[PDB]
């Protein structure tokens, strides 16, 4: 046959046909009926069971090369659509799927060609990828000379290649790195210069190629026993199957209608401790991620991000592939926790990411090295939206106020206690607080949005990898969102530099803004802040038996460590993002993990839960009365107990104080409107709105209508007084010729 | 014959043999006799003259695929040694040759295999390259299924990427094509490294077109004159070059030891050097001492013991870059021939100590703008070679040295076409040259990496950049004073016009003049910065007020500043900056440096001093203070010489010199007190501290000359500045199963 796909179609003729049938019918590949599944139920169930089991075995067997992370493997059909994904974080199902769809639309079939036993590698920025260090290995599967699918394997390399602002600070575009199952030497020598340490990159490549070739054999054996006729139907029915599964889940758990929510997070690049080389990049900006969620009677739904802010000079921007592919690590935690999850769910979801926004920049200068900062801040709002549907329908067990900001990313560089390059960081922000439920408190220090199987790691293992020692590891008091049910609290650890040389560290996380919100009366989780101490003189303080900082920063409004370090240079502020800073032995670094949002009116919380929280270190005593209205009294055993009568009076008094200090929304609005007309707000607020308007006309109209603003009132970004480089002149990807990108999104 | 090289040897077996014969015999490839040259001279001269011409033809023909000068092509033998090189800048003969020898040593023959019609590409930093944007295309030449040589084509791509870099796009001899056809995944992947696609794509089409033309040339020559004759020429030609350099040294120079040194400043402690790493935020000085030894047999040695350590900046150099590009200056004085090839390398001994900025041996080091250190280190060699010319009697060949190729005008953003900016004006191609022992230096005439200096037309530059010329003027008092004055630089005043999202920065020497005067002459003027933001020039122009024009004639008594009362003027000695925002009607002074002078300025003929004042080469005030010449403004407003007054001023300055000078012994004792008290700037002590550790022989001489006790030490960690990288290295030896080539004693 002429084309290499089974049947004689080229890779592009094949996909274009399926995509045309998908558009005309609304069903993947125009499969109005799934004959294999309906006519042969057992064989269909067996095909998933064996293929799913073999894909997981590849992932776990290949994993056994350590000294799990983003490691994952996915089986695709000829058109680049996922059928099955292994255990692990599934944020790369779409990134690798896009890499296949890039080879399809750019005629890789003709050059460099797609042959059996070829090995392709990819991490391209313009195709779509979460992190530059996330390396894809893609292998085509052939049966009797014809192509029937692809295999994808991905890892997060931890030692690849300060204060990046533009993309031009590596890139692999579906490069053919091997043939005949043998890697090319020029690729091996070249890729080992893209890295500071060789061991991690080399083993990771072996792992990916291993798992891929296992899965390749796994398919060749399934097809041999059950026949190609059966497998060929399954490779397209399984996708249309996933779509029907998502539709059935929506109709069963949620409510049709329109849900509107928004999320924010800060980017404080004006601070002197953010040492970026470009002066046009030094300004305070805020991420704006509004979302209009539409759930329809037919079980389809739509996520429209009209009104979002523009991309900025920083590393927190994202890709439309990165945004849509990675949003399912969140969705599979509430709506579709299923091992059948595949691209079928994608074909049952509509995404609108306006071109030019931070989630769909369409500009080649954009950097995305730390996309998580924005992604986790934008996705959390969707928890709240869905929860409104769960709450109204009665499935309160599924309600969740949202995920915490996966923040304070402890990052360090230099030479460790073995006089060797640092490569492995602690990664304690895998265990943040979780949002509160409509039924119970949230889980403290339990999970991250991109991995619900939160693991905090052992202190004794991290101290074998980092030149740091734990002086404390403690639950972060009052970090969880207050509410009838408290959001999960984060936790903190105090690090002391120990046997480090040429050492540097920086902070990474939300500071001025709490990305998550409480739900239906609950409050947002605590926001971030920084603590670090240099020139502590701790060696002499330890030797002399003086007071030394231990534990966690219990009350940063009334700290106890600072006074213990009189000769120290202490940095204690809300600057939760910094650039590389010099550290040396006996200096201190507070690693503070965020908490989750709360649920419900705080003064509906059962008083004993407040007393249990104070005794447990989840809430500072101070706020027991101010926030929850609970009067607690310390007893003989040192434990706090509830004052039943005193609480009732406090709760009744707060209710009157609320009505007194509050104001009718009509009244407050006209006052806020005067400030809007006078353009009275910080530059970060005005820049956010000014940029959001230009990229979102529908958002500007609603804003003007809601505030009853006259057309005479305008908010041009160019008149705020901050740099605006990149707001009117762009570097589109359309400038690149011979490059055909695929659109997974309305814009 | 299994090995692909002619005869059956593999590439490594072949080179390994030739290199062992070179080490053993002191003659390239163990050629004690050149049979072809001696027994068939006409045929020998014919092969060279014809290959040289065919190579030049390929370079000039391919050049017509755009519209540069760094473009160049080189013909190599099977072992990766240069035979011939096209017209153009020859910095990349060694870099590309090193790429070939990398494929030889790392078994490219077995994987990915070296086949006919294959296309390779390379710019690797660890192999050694001048610039990250200088891209190599390497094609193997075959004859009857066997490899007989290589072709290398290079271009300087202007629109690549990568800020205030402090530590380290790498293409490691990648096979980017087969069957003379490029791979699609390579073409797509390359269009993401560049800002605009045009320049990258035409440059590759240019390199390949030239490589294939040279491949056809060899195939044609071999076919007509026979492969037997060519296979002899392909190695005799190298040894031939070695003998040629030996003859030139013995005919032009003098045996002995020459000692010289050069310096340049890295002022990274200034706030306008926005660097992301705080441990790279300090002031440092480059130290480039050179002990030059010419032996009686005609061999010579270049020992850079005592040089400073690599730093957190983009001015470090690879050993291959330092030795491959040094021949751009050697071909301007010692061996200016079109026959130049690697024979000159096998006739020269280089010692670049490991850890120094020229041989860092650390993977973190960056090399983006290594010219700043190279031009400052090479200028000292002119002076050494000149002492041999001057003693032997070839005063015409003397030259005090090359100016720092500084102020590198760099701009970014969007231009008057609302398109990405990629073409910057290249006025630092026309710096002042060093004065000779016979005549003044040439003003605004050349750079060290290109003697064919061209300034460009202002009208052409304004079609490329969003800038307009408000001035273009000879730089007064930039040339080094002396009996014969060093060449003066020039300066242009630029106004930003129709730019958007525009940024600019300065680049060059500031506190230090790298060049020195010779035998009584003085160094050229050092660098400084002038820029003006928020000028309000639009209204000053409209109202008819004074507007800055021309050049910054006297920065000690400027005229522009008073004209700009509302402007933010940056007028300091910070000649290196990171990108800074610029808007229309802002000003940027592009000041090109001059060259060093020769001889005692007091021995300069007075009428030359008067001509210099009249011509804007020397400011009036220095005619008496420096040259001791009294001038009077004549009727026509021109300056003339006062013979009698000049004779007195010269007689008085001679007494002043003896009165204000002191015996060197008396000065040394006082300067020795300061060394013991460690009374000096941190940039000075860090330089010496780093130099001592890398050069024990240099430290030994320092302590000896100053009679310092062993109790006196200068540890770098006690200076008070960051010392990151001094004690902990990421040596390249770590990288697994990567085999490097040492062209240097380290
Ligand atoms: Mn990753
Ligand atoms: Mn170059």
PDB file of C-alpha atoms in Angstrom, chain B residues 292-480:
ATOM      1  CA  UNK B 292      57.289  34.668  23.550  1.00  0.00           C
ATOM      2  CA  UNK B 293      60.303  32.524  22.631  1.00  0.00           C
ATOM      3  CA  UNK B 294      61.789  32.409  19.126  1.00  0.00           C
ATOM      4  CA  UNK B 295      64.343  29.625  18.740  1.00  0.00           C
ATOM      5  CA  UNK B 296      67.359  29.475  16.445  1.00  0.00           C
ATOM      6  CA  UNK B 297      65.777  26.703  14.368  1.00  0.00           C
ATOM      7  CA  UNK B 298      62.808  28.930  13.501  1.00  0.00           C
ATOM      8  CA  UNK B 299      60.320  27.344  15.891  1.00  0.00           C
ATOM      9  CA  UNK B 300      58.589  29.669  18.336  1.00  0.00           C
ATOM     10  CA  UNK B 301      56.585  29.387  21.538  1.00  0.00           C
ATOM     11  CA  UNK B 302      53.651  31.339  22.982  1.00  0.00           C
ATOM     12  CA  UNK B 303      53.346  30.724  26.733  1.00  0.00           C
ATOM     13  CA  UNK B 304      50.473  32.402  28.592  1.00  0.00           C
ATOM     14  CA  UNK B 305      51.460  31.230  32.076  1.00  0.00           C
ATOM     15  CA  UNK B 306      50.132  33.600  34.719  1.00  0.00           C
ATOM     16  CA  UNK B 307      46.837  34.373  32.992  1.00  0.00           C
ATOM     17  CA  UNK B 308      43.732  35.011  35.056  1.00  0.00           C
ATOM     18  CA  UNK B 309      40.930  32.546  35.700  1.00  0.00           C
ATOM     19  CA  UNK B 310      37.708  32.285  33.739  1.00  0.00           C
ATOM     20  CA  UNK B 311      34.935  34.456  35.131  1.00  0.00           C
ATOM     21  CA  UNK B 312      31.159  34.695  35.354  1.00  0.00           C
ATOM     22  CA  UNK B 313      30.720  36.485  32.034  1.00  0.00           C
ATOM     23  CA  UNK B 314      30.649  35.898  28.276  1.00  0.00           C
ATOM     24  CA  UNK B 315      34.259  36.948  27.587  1.00  0.00           C
ATOM     25  CA  UNK B 316      35.974  33.590  28.152  1.00  0.00           C
ATOM     26  CA  UNK B 317      37.502  31.701  25.237  1.00  0.00           C
ATOM     27  CA  UNK B 318      38.047  28.102  24.212  1.00  0.00           C
ATOM     28  CA  UNK B 319      41.598  26.923  23.579  1.00  0.00           C
ATOM     29  CA  UNK B 320      40.609  26.121  19.992  1.00  0.00           C
ATOM     30  CA  UNK B 321      39.057  29.568  19.602  1.00  0.00           C
ATOM     31  CA  UNK B 322      42.175  31.262  20.985  1.00  0.00           C
ATOM     32  CA  UNK B 323      44.613  29.344  18.766  1.00  0.00           C
ATOM     33  CA  UNK B 324      42.419  29.089  15.663  1.00  0.00           C
ATOM     34  CA  UNK B 325      41.621  32.805  15.612  1.00  0.00           C
ATOM     35  CA  UNK B 326      45.031  34.161  16.565  1.00  0.00           C
ATOM     36  CA  UNK B 327      46.135  33.693  12.943  1.00  0.00           C
ATOM     37  CA  UNK B 328      43.913  36.593  11.845  1.00  0.00           C
ATOM     38  CA  UNK B 329      46.573  38.918  13.240  1.00  0.00           C
ATOM     39  CA  UNK B 330      49.591  36.804  12.317  1.00  0.00           C
ATOM     40  CA  UNK B 331      48.489  36.941   8.690  1.00  0.00           C
ATOM     41  CA  UNK B 332      48.633  40.745   9.017  1.00  0.00           C
ATOM     42  CA  UNK B 333      52.337  41.051   9.907  1.00  0.00           C
ATOM     43  CA  UNK B 334      54.353  37.827   9.987  1.00  0.00           C
ATOM     44  CA  UNK B 335      52.812  35.492   7.398  1.00  0.00           C
ATOM     45  CA  UNK B 336      50.494  37.444   5.044  1.00  0.00           C
ATOM     46  CA  UNK B 337      50.138  34.855   2.289  1.00  0.00           C
ATOM     47  CA  UNK B 338      47.267  33.098   0.558  1.00  0.00           C
ATOM     48  CA  UNK B 339      49.049  29.771   1.195  1.00  0.00           C
ATOM     49  CA  UNK B 340      48.298  29.830   4.912  1.00  0.00           C
ATOM     50  CA  UNK B 341      47.115  26.521   6.357  1.00  0.00           C
ATOM     51  CA  UNK B 342      47.649  24.278   9.386  1.00  0.00           C
ATOM     52  CA  UNK B 343      51.374  24.050   8.650  1.00  0.00           C
ATOM     53  CA  UNK B 344      51.690  27.310  10.568  1.00  0.00           C
ATOM     54  CA  UNK B 345      49.999  25.624  13.535  1.00  0.00           C
ATOM     55  CA  UNK B 346      52.421  22.684  13.479  1.00  0.00           C
ATOM     56  CA  UNK B 347      55.134  25.351  13.384  1.00  0.00           C
ATOM     57  CA  UNK B 348      53.846  27.119  16.506  1.00  0.00           C
ATOM     58  CA  UNK B 349      53.818  25.975  20.135  1.00  0.00           C
ATOM     59  CA  UNK B 350      50.967  27.194  22.348  1.00  0.00           C
ATOM     60  CA  UNK B 351      50.752  26.894  26.133  1.00  0.00           C
ATOM     61  CA  UNK B 352      47.382  27.878  27.617  1.00  0.00           C
ATOM     62  CA  UNK B 353      47.265  26.819  31.293  1.00  0.00           C
ATOM     63  CA  UNK B 354      44.155  24.892  32.271  1.00  0.00           C
ATOM     64  CA  UNK B 355      41.684  26.956  34.278  1.00  0.00           C
ATOM     65  CA  UNK B 356      42.541  30.260  32.601  1.00  0.00           C
ATOM     66  CA  UNK B 357      39.992  32.274  30.629  1.00  0.00           C
ATOM     67  CA  UNK B 358      41.502  30.993  27.363  1.00  0.00           C
ATOM     68  CA  UNK B 359      41.445  27.358  28.481  1.00  0.00           C
ATOM     69  CA  UNK B 360      38.798  27.307  31.234  1.00  0.00           C
ATOM     70  CA  UNK B 361      38.143  23.556  31.315  1.00  0.00           C
ATOM     71  CA  UNK B 362      34.729  23.939  32.944  1.00  0.00           C
ATOM     72  CA  UNK B 363      31.348  23.272  31.350  1.00  0.00           C
ATOM     73  CA  UNK B 364      29.614  26.211  33.063  1.00  0.00           C
ATOM     74  CA  UNK B 365      31.721  28.795  31.221  1.00  0.00           C
ATOM     75  CA  UNK B 366      30.135  31.020  28.572  1.00  0.00           C
ATOM     76  CA  UNK B 367      31.833  32.216  25.382  1.00  0.00           C
ATOM     77  CA  UNK B 368      29.187  34.396  23.702  1.00  0.00           C
ATOM     78  CA  UNK B 369      31.281  37.577  23.439  1.00  0.00           C
ATOM     79  CA  UNK B 370      34.854  36.297  23.682  1.00  0.00           C
ATOM     80  CA  UNK B 371      36.250  39.006  21.377  1.00  0.00           C
ATOM     81  CA  UNK B 372      36.449  41.383  24.340  1.00  0.00           C
ATOM     82  CA  UNK B 373      39.216  39.256  25.874  1.00  0.00           C
ATOM     83  CA  UNK B 374      40.830  37.957  22.683  1.00  0.00           C
ATOM     84  CA  UNK B 375      41.483  41.354  21.092  1.00  0.00           C
ATOM     85  CA  UNK B 376      42.877  42.619  24.400  1.00  0.00           C
ATOM     86  CA  UNK B 377      45.240  39.647  24.746  1.00  0.00           C
ATOM     87  CA  UNK B 378      46.492  39.511  21.147  1.00  0.00           C
ATOM     88  CA  UNK B 379      47.412  43.205  20.903  1.00  0.00           C
ATOM     89  CA  UNK B 380      50.458  42.525  23.079  1.00  0.00           C
ATOM     90  CA  UNK B 381      51.948  40.205  20.450  1.00  0.00           C
ATOM     91  CA  UNK B 382      52.267  42.992  17.876  1.00  0.00           C
ATOM     92  CA  UNK B 383      54.609  44.702  20.325  1.00  0.00           C
ATOM     93  CA  UNK B 384      56.736  41.607  20.866  1.00  0.00           C
ATOM     94  CA  UNK B 385      57.061  40.863  17.158  1.00  0.00           C
ATOM     95  CA  UNK B 386      57.770  44.556  16.577  1.00  0.00           C
ATOM     96  CA  UNK B 387      60.873  44.477  18.786  1.00  0.00           C
ATOM     97  CA  UNK B 388      62.307  41.825  16.467  1.00  0.00           C
ATOM     98  CA  UNK B 389      61.359  43.838  13.376  1.00  0.00           C
ATOM     99  CA  UNK B 390      62.859  46.997  14.866  1.00  0.00           C
ATOM    100  CA  UNK B 391      66.105  45.346  15.931  1.00  0.00           C
ATOM    101  CA  UNK B 392      66.575  43.546  12.615  1.00  0.00           C
ATOM    102  CA  UNK B 393      65.863  46.754  10.675  1.00  0.00           C
ATOM    103  CA  UNK B 394      62.426  46.086   9.151  1.00  0.00           C
ATOM    104  CA  UNK B 395      60.886  49.244  10.557  1.00  0.00           C
ATOM    105  CA  UNK B 396      58.138  49.050   7.933  1.00  0.00           C
ATOM    106  CA  UNK B 397      56.714  45.960   9.672  1.00  0.00           C
ATOM    107  CA  UNK B 398      56.651  47.502  13.163  1.00  0.00           C
ATOM    108  CA  UNK B 399      53.211  48.169  14.633  1.00  0.00           C
ATOM    109  CA  UNK B 400      52.359  49.161  18.196  1.00  0.00           C
ATOM    110  CA  UNK B 401      49.226  47.003  18.252  1.00  0.00           C
ATOM    111  CA  UNK B 402      45.528  46.742  17.455  1.00  0.00           C
ATOM    112  CA  UNK B 403      42.866  48.841  19.123  1.00  0.00           C
ATOM    113  CA  UNK B 404      40.181  47.211  21.198  1.00  0.00           C
ATOM    114  CA  UNK B 405      37.381  46.437  18.745  1.00  0.00           C
ATOM    115  CA  UNK B 406      35.045  48.151  21.171  1.00  0.00           C
ATOM    116  CA  UNK B 407      31.771  49.850  21.379  1.00  0.00           C
ATOM    117  CA  UNK B 408      29.819  47.019  19.783  1.00  0.00           C
ATOM    118  CA  UNK B 409      26.545  48.780  19.069  1.00  0.00           C
ATOM    119  CA  UNK B 410      23.788  46.282  19.856  1.00  0.00           C
ATOM    120  CA  UNK B 411      20.083  46.987  19.513  1.00  0.00           C
ATOM    121  CA  UNK B 412      16.937  44.922  19.740  1.00  0.00           C
ATOM    122  CA  UNK B 413      13.223  45.338  19.235  1.00  0.00           C
ATOM    123  CA  UNK B 414      11.078  46.336  16.254  1.00  0.00           C
ATOM    124  CA  UNK B 415      12.238  48.603  13.453  1.00  0.00           C
ATOM    125  CA  UNK B 416      10.776  51.279  11.168  1.00  0.00           C
ATOM    126  CA  UNK B 417       9.178  48.456   9.154  1.00  0.00           C
ATOM    127  CA  UNK B 418       7.340  47.108  12.222  1.00  0.00           C
ATOM    128  CA  UNK B 419       9.437  43.956  11.840  1.00  0.00           C
ATOM    129  CA  UNK B 420      11.948  42.225  14.087  1.00  0.00           C
ATOM    130  CA  UNK B 421      15.344  43.913  14.145  1.00  0.00           C
ATOM    131  CA  UNK B 422      18.272  41.734  13.073  1.00  0.00           C
ATOM    132  CA  UNK B 423      20.887  43.879  11.257  1.00  0.00           C
ATOM    133  CA  UNK B 424      23.023  46.154  13.440  1.00  0.00           C
ATOM    134  CA  UNK B 425      25.469  48.748  12.162  1.00  0.00           C
ATOM    135  CA  UNK B 426      28.989  47.341  12.224  1.00  0.00           C
ATOM    136  CA  UNK B 427      31.099  50.467  12.687  1.00  0.00           C
ATOM    137  CA  UNK B 428      33.569  48.714  15.006  1.00  0.00           C
ATOM    138  CA  UNK B 429      34.963  47.183  11.817  1.00  0.00           C
ATOM    139  CA  UNK B 430      36.849  50.491  11.393  1.00  0.00           C
ATOM    140  CA  UNK B 431      38.971  51.171  14.477  1.00  0.00           C
ATOM    141  CA  UNK B 432      42.263  53.010  14.725  1.00  0.00           C
ATOM    142  CA  UNK B 433      45.394  50.999  14.019  1.00  0.00           C
ATOM    143  CA  UNK B 434      48.717  51.021  15.805  1.00  0.00           C
ATOM    144  CA  UNK B 435      51.388  53.510  14.842  1.00  0.00           C
ATOM    145  CA  UNK B 436      54.467  52.122  13.119  1.00  0.00           C
ATOM    146  CA  UNK B 437      58.131  53.021  13.537  1.00  0.00           C
ATOM    147  CA  UNK B 438      57.916  55.031  10.294  1.00  0.00           C
ATOM    148  CA  UNK B 439      54.515  56.725  10.185  1.00  0.00           C
ATOM    149  CA  UNK B 440      51.307  57.439  12.058  1.00  0.00           C
ATOM    150  CA  UNK B 441      48.681  54.769  12.467  1.00  0.00           C
ATOM    151  CA  UNK B 442      45.573  54.677  10.320  1.00  0.00           C
ATOM    152  CA  UNK B 443      42.431  56.236  11.778  1.00  0.00           C
ATOM    153  CA  UNK B 444      39.044  54.490  11.572  1.00  0.00           C
ATOM    154  CA  UNK B 445      40.581  51.973   9.211  1.00  0.00           C
ATOM    155  CA  UNK B 446      40.489  48.403  10.498  1.00  0.00           C
ATOM    156  CA  UNK B 447      39.719  45.900  13.225  1.00  0.00           C
ATOM    157  CA  UNK B 448      41.968  43.113  14.453  1.00  0.00           C
ATOM    158  CA  UNK B 449      39.639  40.417  13.087  1.00  0.00           C
ATOM    159  CA  UNK B 450      39.374  42.158   9.704  1.00  0.00           C
ATOM    160  CA  UNK B 451      42.092  44.377   8.167  1.00  0.00           C
ATOM    161  CA  UNK B 452      39.808  45.199   5.203  1.00  0.00           C
ATOM    162  CA  UNK B 453      37.957  47.740   7.302  1.00  0.00           C
ATOM    163  CA  UNK B 454      34.692  49.105   5.930  1.00  0.00           C
ATOM    164  CA  UNK B 455      32.584  51.636   7.788  1.00  0.00           C
ATOM    165  CA  UNK B 456      29.409  51.307   5.757  1.00  0.00           C
ATOM    166  CA  UNK B 457      27.216  54.063   4.384  1.00  0.00           C
ATOM    167  CA  UNK B 458      25.056  55.975   6.840  1.00  0.00           C
ATOM    168  CA  UNK B 459      22.193  55.816   4.364  1.00  0.00           C
ATOM    169  CA  UNK B 460      22.424  52.025   4.151  1.00  0.00           C
ATOM    170  CA  UNK B 461      22.548  51.595   7.928  1.00  0.00           C
ATOM    171  CA  UNK B 462      19.468  53.808   8.261  1.00  0.00           C
ATOM    172  CA  UNK B 463      17.611  51.458   5.917  1.00  0.00           C
ATOM    173  CA  UNK B 464      18.349  48.607   8.357  1.00  0.00           C
ATOM    174  CA  UNK B 465      18.273  50.094  11.870  1.00  0.00           C
ATOM    175  CA  UNK B 466      15.623  52.362  13.456  1.00  0.00           C
ATOM    176  CA  UNK B 467      18.344  54.964  14.032  1.00  0.00           C
ATOM    177  CA  UNK B 468      19.303  58.222  12.328  1.00  0.00           C
ATOM    178  CA  UNK B 469      22.773  59.760  12.280  1.00  0.00           C
ATOM    179  CA  UNK B 470      23.125  63.099  14.038  1.00  0.00           C
ATOM    180  CA  UNK B 471      26.914  62.833  13.879  1.00  0.00           C
ATOM    181  CA  UNK B 472      29.811  60.929  12.346  1.00  0.00           C
ATOM    182  CA  UNK B 473      33.183  62.342  13.253  1.00  0.00           C
ATOM    183  CA  UNK B 474      36.834  61.542  13.873  1.00  0.00           C
ATOM    184  CA  UNK B 475      37.499  60.905  17.563  1.00  0.00           C
ATOM    185  CA  UNK B 476      39.890  63.589  18.776  1.00  0.00           C
ATOM    186  CA  UNK B 477      42.690  62.442  21.094  1.00  0.00           C
ATOM    187  CA  UNK B 478      41.662  58.792  20.768  1.00  0.00           C
ATOM    188  CA  UNK B 479      44.904  57.809  19.057  1.00  0.00           C
ATOM    189  CA  UNK B 480      47.833  56.956  21.283  1.00  0.00           C
TER     190      UNK B 480
END
